[PDB]
Amino acid sequence: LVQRITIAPQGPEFSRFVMGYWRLMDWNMSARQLVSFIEEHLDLGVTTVDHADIYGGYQCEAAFGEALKLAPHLRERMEIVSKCGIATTAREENVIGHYITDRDHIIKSAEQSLINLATDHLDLLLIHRPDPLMDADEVADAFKHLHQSGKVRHFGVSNFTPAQFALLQSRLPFTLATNQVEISPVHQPLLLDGTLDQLQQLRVRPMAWSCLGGGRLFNDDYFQPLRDELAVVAEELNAGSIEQVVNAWVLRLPSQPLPIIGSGKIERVRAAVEAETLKMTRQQWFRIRKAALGYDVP
Amino acid sequence: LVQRITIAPQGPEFSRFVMGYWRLMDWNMSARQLVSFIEEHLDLGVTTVDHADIYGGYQCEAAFGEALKLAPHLRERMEIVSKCGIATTAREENVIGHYITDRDHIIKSAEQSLINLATDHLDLLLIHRPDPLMDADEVADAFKHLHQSGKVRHFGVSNFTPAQFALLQSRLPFTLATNQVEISPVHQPLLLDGTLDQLQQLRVRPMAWSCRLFNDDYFQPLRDELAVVAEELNAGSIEQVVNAWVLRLPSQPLPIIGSGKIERVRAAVEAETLKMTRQQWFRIRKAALGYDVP
Amino acid sequence: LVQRITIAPQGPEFSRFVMGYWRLMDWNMSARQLVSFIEEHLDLGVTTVDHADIYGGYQCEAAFGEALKLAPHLRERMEIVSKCGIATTAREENVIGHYITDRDHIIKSAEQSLINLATDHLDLLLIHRPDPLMDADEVADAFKHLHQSGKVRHFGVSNFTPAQFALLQSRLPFTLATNQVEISPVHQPLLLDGTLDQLQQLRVRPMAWSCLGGGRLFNDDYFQPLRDELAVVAEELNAGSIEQVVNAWVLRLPSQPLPIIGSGKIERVRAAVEAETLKMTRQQWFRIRKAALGYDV
Ligand SMILES: NC(=O)c1ccc[n+]([C@@H]2O[C@H](COP(=O)([O-])OP(=O)(O)OC[C@H]3O[C@@H](n4cnc5c(N)ncnc54)[C@H](OP(=O)(O)O)[C@@H]3O)[C@@H](O)[C@H]2O)c1
Ligand SMILES: NC(=O)c1ccc[n+]([C@@H]2O[C@H](COP(=O)([O-])OP(=O)(O)OC[C@H]3O[C@@H](n4cnc5c(N)ncnc54)[C@H](OP(=O)(O)O)[C@@H]3O)[C@@H](O)[C@H]2O)c1
Ligand SMILES: NC(=O)c1ccc[n+]([C@@H]2O[C@H](COP(=O)([O-])OP(=O)(O)OC[C@H]3O[C@@H](n4cnc5c(N)ncnc54)[C@H](OP(=O)(O)O)[C@@H]3O)[C@@H](O)[C@H]2O)c1
Numbered sequence: 101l102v103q104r105i106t107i108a109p110q111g112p113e114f115s116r117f118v119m120g121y122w123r124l125m126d127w128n129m130s131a132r133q134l135v136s137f138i139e140e141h142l143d144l145g146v147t148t149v150d151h152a153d154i155y156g157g158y159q160c161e162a163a164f165g166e167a168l169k170l171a172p173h174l175r176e177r178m179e180i181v182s183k184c185g186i187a188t189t190a191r192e193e194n195v196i197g198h199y200i201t202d203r204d205h206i207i208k209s210a211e212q213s214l215i216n217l218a219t220d221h222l223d224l225l226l227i228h229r230p231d232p233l234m235d236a237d238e239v240a241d242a243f244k245h246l247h248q249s250g251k252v253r254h255f256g257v258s259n260f261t262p263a264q265f266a267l268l269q270s271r272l273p274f275t276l277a278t279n280q281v282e283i284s285p286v287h288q289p290l291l292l293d294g295t296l297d298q299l300q301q302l303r304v305r306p307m308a309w310s311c312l313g314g315g316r317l318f319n320d321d322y323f324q325p326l327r328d329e330l331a332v333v334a335e336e337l338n339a340g341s342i343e344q345v346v347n348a349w350v351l352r353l354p355s356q357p358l359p360i361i362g363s364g365k366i367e368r369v370r371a372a373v374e375a376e377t378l379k380m381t382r383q384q385w386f387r388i389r390k391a392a393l394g395y396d397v398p
Numbered sequence: 399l400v401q402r403i404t405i406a407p408q409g410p411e412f413s414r415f416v417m418g419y420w421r422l423m424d425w426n427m428s429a430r431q432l433v434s435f436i437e438e439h440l441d442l443g444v445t446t447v448d449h450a451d452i453y454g455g456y457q458c459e460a461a462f463g464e465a466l467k468l469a470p471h472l473r474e475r476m477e478i479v480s481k482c483g484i485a486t487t488a489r490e491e492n493v494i495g496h497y498i499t500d501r502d503h504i505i506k507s508a509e510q511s512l513i514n515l516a517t518d519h520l521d522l523l524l525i526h527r528p529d530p531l532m533d534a535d536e537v538a539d540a541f542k543h544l545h546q547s548g549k550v551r552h553f554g555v556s557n558f559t560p561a562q563f564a565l566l567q568s569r570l571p572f573t574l575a576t577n578q579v580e581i582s583p584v585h586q587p588l589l590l591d592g593t594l595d596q597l598q599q600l601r602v603r604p605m606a607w608s609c610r611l612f613n614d615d616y617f618q619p620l621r622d623e624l625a626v627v628a629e630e631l632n633a634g635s636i637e638q639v640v641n642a643w644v645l646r647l648p649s650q651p652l653p654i655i656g657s658g659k660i661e662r663v664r665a666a667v668e669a670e671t672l673k674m675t676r677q678q679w680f681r682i683r684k685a686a687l688g689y690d691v692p
Numbered sequence: 693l694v695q696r697i698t699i700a701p702q703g704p705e706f707s708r709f710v711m712g713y714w715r716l717m718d719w720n721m722s723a724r725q726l727v728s729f730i731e732e733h734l735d736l737g738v739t740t741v742d743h744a745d746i747y748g749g750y751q752c753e754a755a756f757g758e759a760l761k762l763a764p765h766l767r768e769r770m771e772i773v774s775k776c777g778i779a780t781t782a783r784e785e786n787v788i789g790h791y792i793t794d795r796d797h798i799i800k801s802a803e804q805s806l807i808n809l810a811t812d813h814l815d816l817l818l819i820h821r822p823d824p825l826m827d828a829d830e831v832a833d834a835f836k837h838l839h840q841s842g843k844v845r846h847f848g849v850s851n852f853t854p855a856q857f858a859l860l861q862s863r864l865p866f867t868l869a870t871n872q873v874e875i876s877p878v879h880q881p882l883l884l885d886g887t888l889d890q891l892q893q894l895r896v897r898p899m900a901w902s903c904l905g906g907g908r909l910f911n912d913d914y915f916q917p918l919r920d921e922l923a924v925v926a927e928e929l930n931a932g933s934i935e936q937v938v939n940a941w942v943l944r945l946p947s948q949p950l951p952i953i954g955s956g957k958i959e960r961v962r963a964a965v966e967a968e969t970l971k972m973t974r975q976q977w978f979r980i981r982k983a984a985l986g987y988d989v
Contacts, residue, residue: 187677197690198680229692232589233679235648236598259692262855263560263592267599291824294855300828301859354827382825383779386790389824396789398821398851485975495988496978527989530883530981531974533946534892561854561886565893 101145102373105358107305111277112223112254114148114179116351117373118307120360121149121164125156127364134164135171140366142177144373150280150307150360151217153184153209153228158191161216169218180219181307183228183258183280184209199231206242214251224277225252230264240271256280262298276304283308283350283357285326285392286317291353300355308357311350312343315362329391337378340371347375349388400443400667403652405603409575410521410552412446412477414645415667416605418656419447419462423454425658432465433472438660440475442667448578448605448654449515450481450526451507455488459514466516473517479578479605480515481556482507483526497529504540512549522575523550528562538569545572554578560596574602581606581644581651583620583686589647598649606651609644612636623685627678634665641669643682694737694965697950699897703869704815704846706740706771708943709965710899712952713741716755717748719956726759727766732958734769736965742872742899742952743809744775745801745820749782753808760810767811773899774809775850775872776801777820791823798834802844816846816869822856832863839866848872848899854890872899875949877918877941877984878909892947900949903942904935907954921983925976932963939967941980 102115119141129137138149151161161182168174185201187194210225225246227239246252255272257265258280269276279299281290287310290296299306317323330342339345347359361372390396401414417439427435436447449459459480466473483499485492508523523544525537544550554576555563567574577597579588585608588594597604611617624636633639641653655666684690698705711733721729730741743753753774760767779785779792802817817838819831838844848870849857861868871891873882875898882888891898909915922934931937942951953961982988 194677196677196681196684198677199691200676202676230590232586232683232691233646233648233676261590261592261595263595267595270599292822292853294853297853297855297859301862352825354825382792382794383786383788383790385825386788390788397791397824492975494975494979494982496975497989498974500974528884531944531946531977559884559886561889565889568893 102376103145105305105356107358108254108256108277109275109303111275111304112179114305114307114358115146116358116376117146118148118150118181118358118360119146119369120309120362121151121160122155122362123364124160124163129364131163131166131170134167135174137364137366138167138171138174141369142174144370146361146369146373147177148179148181148358151180151182151213152226153182153213154186154188154190157188161213165216165218175219179223180217181224181226182213182217182222183226184213185228185231199229199233201227201231201234201239203238203242206239207245210242210246210252221251221253223253224256225254226256226258226278226280227260227268228258230257230260234264234268236268236271239268243272262294265298275302278304278307280307280309280360282310283353284311284313284317285346285349285388286313286323288389288393296353296355306355306357307360308350309360310362311346311359312362317343317346323392325394326388326392329388333380333384333388336384337380339378340374343368344371344375344378345380345388347372348378348380349385351375352380352385400445401670403603403650405605405652406575407573407601409573409602410477412605412652413444414652414670415444416446416448416479416652416654417444417663418607418654419449419458420453421656421658422458422461427658429461429464429468432461433469435658435660436462436465436472436476437469439663440472442664444655444663444667445475446477446479446652448479449511451511452484452486452488452526456486459511463514463516473515477521478515478517479522479524480508480511480520481524481526482511483529497527497531499525499529499532499537501536501540501543504537505543508540508544508550519548520550522552522554524554524556524576524578525558525566526556528555528558532562532566534566534569537566541570560592563596573600576603576605576652578605578607578654580608581647582609582611583640583643583682584611584614584617586683586687594647594649603650603652605654606644607654608656609641609653611640617686619688620682620686623682627674627682630678631672631674633672634668637662638665638669638672639674639682641666642672642674643679645669646674646679694968697897697948699899699950700846700869701867701895703867703896704771706950707737708950708968709738709939710740710742710773710950710952711738711961712901712954713743713752713756714747714954715956716752721755721956723755723758723762726755727763729958730756730759730766730770731763733961734766736962738953738961738965739769740771740773740815740950742773743805744818745805746778746780746782753805757808757810764810771815772809772811773816773818774802774805774814775818775820776805777823791821791825793819793823793826793831795830795834798831799837802834802838806843813842814844816848817844818848818850818870818872819860821851822849822853826856826860828860828863831860835864835866854886857890867894868896870896870899870950872901874902875900875942875945876903876905876909877922877938877980878905878915880981880985883945888945888947897948897950900942900951902954903951904938904954909938910934915984917986918980918983921980925972925980928976929970929972931970932966935960935964936967936970937972937980939964940970940972941977943968944972944977
C-alpha cells in the first residue's frame with residue numbers, strides 16, 4: 101500500500117498520495133456510488149482526502165458528508181484536509197472574487213466544514229490562498245480557537261510565498277503542517293523561487309496539486325515534446341502511462357511532495373499509486389525537465 | 399485629531415498621517431506663510447513631518463527652519479523625520495547622482511539637518527536609499543554615535559528590500575523604526591513581493607510615500623471605482639478613498655500627505671473616519687490592476 | 693605581496709586575488725612551463741588557486757597534478773579550491789547536461805580531485821551550481837565524511853541563492869566559507885538581488901568569477917561607453933590599465949570579494965594584482981556603474 105509520511109515535525113501522518121475531491125461535482129456520483137469509490141481508493145493506501153471551502157460552489161464538502169453518513173465506518177480510516185480563505189462569486193454577497201482571512205470568517209468556515217462532512221474534526225485546515233489584507237494575528241487566533249476545540253488537529257497554508265509562510269509562522273506555537281503548492285513538469289517556478297527550498301529546510305512536506313497541469317497535459321498541443329519524452333522514459337522505466345512518469349518526476353524532488361490525484365476513475369487512481377514503485381534516474385529527470393521547458397539547466 | 403501610532407517595537411509614536419515637505423519649494427511660500435501652514439496641519443492632528451537631506455535642491459530643510467525660527471513653540475508639537483544617503487547633481491561637487499552611506503558623512507549630514515531645521519535633535523533618521531556600497535558596520539557606527547549625542551532618537555531605512563533591511567538591522571542594537579516605501583493602487587508591487595510581509599511580521603509600520611493617479615488617463619476605470627466607492631462610503635473626494643485604501647493594509651501604513659493646499663491636507667486626514675469594506679478594497683485593487691486575485 | 697584575507701568566521705585564509713585555472717588547457721602550457729607560471733604567481737602573493745570537477749573536459753585538475761608532481765614543494769604554499777556537482781556532455785555517460793549532488797558522488801569526486809591534483813587534501817570544496825534535486829542531508833553528509841577523513845578542510849557553495857545557501861547551511865555544523873558568484877561591472881544582478889547582502893551579513897567573503905566578463909569587456913562592441921569610462925577613471929586614478937580599474941571596482945564592494953584572475957599571461961597576472969593600491973571613490977564607482985548599465989539609481 102502507499103507508504104505513510106509525517107508531513108511536518110509535529111505534523112500528522114498522511115498517505116504519500118492524497119485523493120482530491122475538487123471535481124467531485126463533475127464525477128456525478130450518488131452517495132451510494134461515492135462511498136464505493138472512497139472504499140476502493142483507501143484500500144490502496146490512499147487515506148488522505150483533500151477538500152476545500154469554495155469547492156464545487158460550496159457543494160463538494162456537503163456532497164462528501166452524505167457518503168460518510170451512510171458509511172460512517174469510514175471516517176477513522178482517513179485524514180480530511182480542507183481550506184478556507186476565499187470568497188467565490190457563487191454567493192450573492194460576493195459581487196467580486198476576493199479573500200476573507202478575517203478571524204471570525206475562518207472559524208465560521210471551519211465549523212461549517214465539520215458540519216458538511218458530517219465529521220467532528222478536521223485533520224488539516226489550510227488557509228486556501230495568500231491575502232494582501234491578511235493579518236497574521238487574526239489568523240493565529242482563529243487557529244488557537246479551532247485547536248482548543250478539538251475541531252482541527254493541524255494547520256497549514258496554500259500557495260504561500262516563503263515570506264508569507266514565515267509571516268504567519270511567527271504567530272504560531274506549532275509548525276505549519278504543509279504548504280499545498282502546484283508542481284508539475286509544466287509548472288516549475290516553485291522549484292527555484294525558494295518555496296521548495298524553505299519547505300525542505302523546515303522539513304515540511306508540500307502537497308502538490310495539478311501534477312497533470314489540470315489535465316491539459318494530454319490535451320494542450322503545446323506539450324508534445326514533453327509527452328514524447330515522457331513516453332520514451334516510460335519505456336525505460338517500464339511504466340504504464342506517461343502520467344506515472346510525471347507522478348514520479350514530481351515524487352522525486354528533495355522536498356518530497358505528496359501528489360494529489362484528481363481523477364474520478366478508480367482505475368486511473370490505481371495506476372497513479374504505482375508510480376511510487378518506479379525508480380527514475382537523475383538524467384531521466386533532467387531529460388523530462390528539458391523536454392517540458394525547451395532549454396538546459398544553468 | 400488624527401490617530402496616534404507607535405511605528406515599531408521600542409519605536410516612536412507618530413501621527414497616523416504624515417506631512418511631506420519634498421515639494422515645499424513648489425508651494426511658493428514665505429516663512430510668514432509657512433508658519434501658518436505648519437500651525438494649521440498640526441492643529442489638524444498631523445504632527446509628523448517628513449524631510450530629507452536633498453529635498454528642494456538641498457534647501458527644503460533650511461526653509462522649514464526659518465518658519466520654525468519665527469515660531470519657537472512649534473518644534474515640540476511635532477516629530478521630525480529626515481533622511482540621508484543620496485547625492486544629487488545639484489551640488490557642484492557631485493558630477494553623477496549617487497549615494498553616500500559612509501560613517502563620517504551620515505553624521506556630517508545628520509548634524510546639518512539639525513542646523514537647518516532649527517532644532518537640537520531628529521526623531522527619526524532614515525537611510526534614504528539602499529546603497530550597493532553600504533557597509534552595515536560603518537552605518538551602524540554613525541547611528542550609534544548620533545544616538546549617544548542625543549541628536550537622533552530613532553533610526554530607520556527607506557526603499558529597502560527585506561534582505562537589505564535585515565543586513566542593516568543585524569548590525570543594530572535597536573529596532574529599526576520604519577521603512578518608508580511607496581504604496582498606492584497605482585503601485586502595489588510591495589503588497590506581495592515580501593516587503594510588507596517582513597514589516598507586518600516585525601510589527602514595524604511603513605510610512606507609505608506617494609500614496610499622477612488623476613493625471614494619467616490609463617487610470618480612468620480606477621478613478622471610476624474610487625468615485626463609485628466614495629459614493630458608497632460617503633467620501634468627500636476619491637482621494638479620501640485612496641488614502642483609506644492604503645490606510646487599511648494589515649501592515650498599517652502612515653500615509654504621507656504631499657499637498658501644499660491645507661484644504662487637501664484636512665480632506666486626506668478625514669480619510670480615517672471612512673469604513674471601507676474588504677470587497678471594496680479588492681474592487682479598487684482590480685480596477686487598478688485590471689485582473690482578479692489568483 | 694597581495695594582502696591576506698580570512699574568507700569566513702572560522703574559515704580559511706586565502707589571498708585577496710585567487711588564480712583560476714578554467715582555461716588552463718587553452719594556455720597550451722607544458723608541465724615544465726606551468727610549474728614556472730604557478731611558481732611566479734605565488735611569488736606575487738596569489739597563493740590560492742581555483743579549480744573544478746569539469747574544467748577543461750575534466751583535464752585541468754590532472755594537468756595541475758603534473759605541475760605539482762615535478763615540483764611538490766609548492767603545495768604547502770598554496771590553497772586549493774575545487775568543485776563538483778555538475779555533469780557535462782564532455783563525458784559519454786551524460787546524454788544531457790545536468791547536476792549530480794548525491795552523497796556518494798560528492799565523496800567520489802573529491803577523492804578524484806586529490807588524485808588528479810596529486811595532493812592528500814583540498815583546502816575548500818564547493819558544490820558548483822545549485823541543483824533542483826539537491827538534498828541537503830545528503831550533501832551535508834558527504835561533507836562531514838570528507839571532513840573527518842582530513843581530505844577537505846573547508847566547504848562552500850557556488851552560484852547559490854540566499855535560500856539555497858540558507859538551506860544547505862541548516863544541515864552543516866560548519867560555516868560555509870564562501871559563495872563563489874559572478875561579479876563584474878558587466879554582471880550586477882547580485883549587487884541588488886540580495887545575494888551579496890546575505891554574504892556581508894554573515895561575514896562570508898565571496899570569490900568572484902569572470903570579473904572581466906570572460907574577456908568580452910575588451911571585445912564586445914556593446915561595451916564602448918564602459919571602456920571609455922574605465923579609461924577616464926584610469927588616468928584619474930593613475931591606474932595601469934582599464935582591467936585594474938575593473939578589479940578595483942570589484943574590491944571596492946562591501947562584501948569584500950576575492951577576484952579570480954583567469955589570464956594565462958603572467959604579466960597580466962602581475963598587472964591585475966596591482967589594482968590593490970588604487971583608491972577608487974564612490975562617485976567614480978557609480979560612474980563606472982552607469983557607463984555599464986545606462987541609467988542612474
Ligand atoms: N490549493 C489550491 O489552490 C488548489 C487549486 C486547484 C486544485 N487543488 C486540488 O489539487 C488537485 C489537483 O488538481 P486537478 O486540477 O484536480 O489535478 P490533476 O491531477 O492535474 O488532474 C488531472 C485531470 O486530468 C484528467 N486525466 C487524468 N488522467 C487522464 C488521462 N489519461 N487522459 C485524459 N485526462 C486525464 C482527470 O480527469 P478524469 O478522471 O476525471 O477524466 C483530472 O481532471 C485537485 O483534486 C484539488 O483538490 C488545490
Ligand atoms: N523615500 C523616498 O525616496 C521619497 C522620494 C520622493 C518623495 N518622498 C516623500 O513621499 C511623500 C509623498 O510623496 P508626494 O510624492 O510628496 O506625495 P503624493 O501623495 O504623491 O502627493 C500628491 C501630489 O498630487 C497633487 N494632487 C493632489 N490631489 C490632486 C488632485 N485632486 N488633482 C491633481 N493633483 C493633485 C498634489 O499637489 P497639490 O497641493 O500641489 O496641488 C501633490 O503634489 C512625501 O513625504 C515625500 O517627501 C519619499
Ligand atoms: N563558479 C563558477 O561557476 C565559475 C564558472 C566559470 C569560471 N569560474 C572561475 O572564475 C575565473 C574567472 O573566469 P575567466 O572566465 O577566467 O575570467 P575573466 O577574468 O573574465 O577572464 C578575462 C579573459 O579575458 C582575457 N583578457 C585579460 N586581460 C585582457 C586584456 N587586457 N585584453 C584582452 N583580453 C584580455 C583573458 O585571456 P588572456 O590573458 O588569457 O589571453 C581571459 O580569457 C576562472 O579562472 C575560473 O576558475 C567559476
